[PDB]
Amino acid sequence: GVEVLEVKTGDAITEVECFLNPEMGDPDENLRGFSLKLSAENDFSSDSPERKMLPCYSTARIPLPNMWEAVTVQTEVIGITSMLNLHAGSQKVHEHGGGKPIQGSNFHFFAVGGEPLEMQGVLMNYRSKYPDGTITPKNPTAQSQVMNTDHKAYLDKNNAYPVECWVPDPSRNENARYFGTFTGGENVPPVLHVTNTATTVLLDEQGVGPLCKADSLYVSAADICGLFTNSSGTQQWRGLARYFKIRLRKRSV
C-alpha cells in the first residue's frame, strides 16, 4: 500500500527458509500428517464433518531483519518417497500383493506474500455444519456454492481454514504470489518433483515482488497428497510438509 521507488544495492539481500508442516487433521498423537478417516454419503441437510477429518491451510509469519521485497522462492514437498512404504497399514492390492499406494484427489498449493494470504470461500454444500475450531464462510447461502463475495478471509491462523472451504482470492492478493493445482479423482496418481535447481520469480509485470509489511514475510501451503486406504477400506488424507527458501532485497518506498 506504498509508492515503490528504487531497489537498494550494495547487506541489501537476505535469505529466509522455513519447513511448513501440513495440517491434515492429526486425529491422534501417532497420526500426525493424516486426517481422521473419511465419512461418506452424509445428506447435504445433515453434513457435520469432524474437525480432525478436515485438512486446513498451513501458514507461517517469518520475521525479517528490522521494505524487504521477496524476489524468488525455491519450494518443494518434503518426504515424497515415504509413499514407497507399502508394508505399513495399507490395504493389500490383491491376495499376496503389496499395500495400496496413496492416490486420489490431491491439492498442492503455496503462496509467498508481504501480508497474510487473502482467501475467498466456496462450498460444495452451503448447509455443511462445520465443527468448532474451524473458520468457514459465515452466513452461507446457496450462492456460497458458486461465488458469494461476502466470504473473504485472511489466512491468519494455522489448522483453522479448511482447504475444502477456501481458495486464494484472485480479486485480492496484490502483495502476494500464489500457485496451486487441484487434481481430483479416486485413482489419480500423486506426481511430485524435487530439485534444488528450480526457482520461481516473485516479481510482477513492473519488476516488484511482495513487499513485507511490518518486516514480516508470510508463507502459506496446502499439500494434500491423496488418500491412504487402510486394510479395512477406510480412507484418510495424507499430507507432507513444504520447504521454502525465499530471497529478499531492500526496496526504497
Contact positions with its own copies (CB under 8 A) in 65-94: 74, 76, 78-94
- What are the angstrom distances between the C-alpha of 233 and each of 52, 94, 162, 236, 238? 18, 13, 24, 10, 15
Residues 212-251 that bind its own copies (CB under 8 A): 222, 224-227, 229, 231-235, 239-241, 243, 245
Q: Are 151 and 144 in contact, with CB atoms under 8 Å apart?
A: yes
Nearer to its own copies, 66 or 81 (CB): 81
- What are the angstrom distances between the C-alpha of 116 and each of 60, 165, 221? 9, 17, 12
7: contact with its own copies by CB under 8 A: no
Q: Are 182 and 86 in contact, with CB atoms under 8 Å apart?
A: no
State in angstroms the smallest separation of the CB of 84 from its own copies. 4
Binding mask 117-156 for its own copies (x = CB under 8 A): ---x-xxxxxxx-------------xx-xxx-x-------
Q: Are 110 and 179 in contact, with CB atoms under 8 Å apart?
A: yes
Binding mask 36-55 for its own copies (x = CB under 8 A): -xxxxxxxx--x-x---x-x
156-171 burial code (b ≥16 CB/10 A, e <16): eeebbbbbbbbbbbee
CA distance 228 to 234: 8
Nearer to its own copies, 68 or 166 (CB): 166
Nearer to its own copies, 149 or 252 (CB): 149
Residues 152-191 that bind its own copies (CB under 8 A): 163-168, 170-171, 173, 176-191
State in angstroms the smallest separation of the CB of 213 from its own copies. 17
Nearer to its own copies, 172 or 250 (CB): 172
- Rg of the chain, C-alpha, whole Å: 20
Q: Please tell me the count of residues contacting its own copies according to CB under 8 A.
A: 119
Residues 9-38 that bind its own copies (CB under 8 A): 17, 19-22, 29-34, 37-38
CA distance 74 to 129: 38
